[PDB]
Amino acid sequence: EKDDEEADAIYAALDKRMDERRKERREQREKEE
RNA sequence: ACUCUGGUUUCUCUUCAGAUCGCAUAAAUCUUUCGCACUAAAGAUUUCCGUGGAGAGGAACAACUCUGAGUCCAAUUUUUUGAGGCCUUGCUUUGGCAAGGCUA
């Protein structure tokens, strides 16, 4: 639903906010590995 | 001994951090080793608990402590006198200079 989709977008933004802590280095190591 | 910066507290955001980033110490995955892997070790990657540095914004009272900066000597030994005057020679830039001999 509209509220449900807004909530899912908000929570996805929350989750992507968090791995940003090591996002650059984690993604670089994963690409190298 | 006169004037001027810089504050501190709190909330949020951005970046770097191998520094006991933490006087503490978790979990997962992969590899290797041997056992035969909770009762085991090594290496690597990740995630989490949560920190320092710098920068940026917001909002609350302290504003010159501190950090800095700009702002009483006359008696030996130094700054309260042994100072001034005469003579010769070389050159006179004819003012006298240079050395020596003197008198005080």
Side-chain angles (χ1 to χ4, degrees), chain A residues 5-33:
Chain A
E5 288 292 317
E6 181 87 16
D8 300 346
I10 278 167
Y11 286 126
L14 264 276
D15 283 15
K16 64 199 311 264
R17 256 189 99 64
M18 288 336 320
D19 36 358
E20 188 53 283
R21 262 178 279 208
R22 201 98 186 279
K23 180 152 93 182
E24 39 171 59
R25 299 168 193 89
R26 166 180 41 80
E27 92 194 359
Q28 184 184 349
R29 206 69 175 207
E30 188 181 354
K31 187 204 306 159
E32 294 299 330
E33 197 174 3

